[PDB]
Amino acid sequence: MVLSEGEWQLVLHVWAKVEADVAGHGQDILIRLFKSHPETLEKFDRFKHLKTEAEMKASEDLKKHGVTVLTALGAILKKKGHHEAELKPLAQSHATKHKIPIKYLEFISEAIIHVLHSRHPGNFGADAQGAMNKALELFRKDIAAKYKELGYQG
Numbered sequence: 001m002v003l004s005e006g007e008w009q010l011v012l013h014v015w016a017k018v019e020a021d022v023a024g025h026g027q028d029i030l031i032r033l034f035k036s037h038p039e040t041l042e043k044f045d046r047f048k049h050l051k052t053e054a055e056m057k058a059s060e061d062l063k064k065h066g067v068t069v070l071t072a073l074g075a076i077l078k079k080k081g082h083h084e085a086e087l088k089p090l091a092q093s094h095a096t097k098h099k100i101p102i103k104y105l106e107f108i109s110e111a112i113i114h115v116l117h118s119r120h121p122g123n124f125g126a127d128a129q130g131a132m133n134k135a136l137e138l139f140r141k142d143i144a145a146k147y148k149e150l151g152y153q154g
């Protein structure tokens with residue numbers, strides 16, 4: 001898979017909007033993921049005690065982790081597909097430490113797209129969506145490759 005320059009520009013255009021409230025987005029994205037796919041919460045020792053949306057929104061630590069996740073993702077997308085060095089420490093931790101199947105990266109991808117629509121009603125069109133989808137798909141495929149490289153079936 002390869003994106004056009006056009007597609008990458010739309011991805012980065014949308015990302016600047018995320019970077020205006022990273023905490024806000026990172027918080028909503030984690031919560032969306034936890035709500036839609038509750039089995040993902042169980043992977044988080046620090047958070048799995050959070051039963052409901054209202055509890056999740058009042059956790060400062062969940063908000064902080066959202067910043068962590070979006071910071072790393074942002075550094076990756078900014079590379080426009082030349083992201084191998086950024087991917088390695090990430091593939092390493094999520095494969096060997098955290099034990100996250102690739103299927104869960106598809107779920108958080110869907111969460112990101114949803115939050116982007118919720119947070120940017122008039123901004124985020126069919127085209128930007130198509131671009132973000134391809135960018136996230138690229139990330140998922142290349143991280144799946146790095147899992148296999150480390151000996152893991154993602």
Ligand code: HEM
Binds near residue numbers: 108
């Ligand atoms: C765009 C997707 C993702 C990015 C960029 C990302 C990034 C990160 C980063 C930077 C960390 C902290 C350092 C590390 O442990 O590697 C982290 C920790 C973690 N990630 Fe992810 N992650 C992603 C998706 C997921 C998903 C889908 C799950 C589980 C369903 C997951 C589970 C975890 C866990 C359990 C930790 C350790 C959290 C802690 O207790 O501090 N990640 N992730």
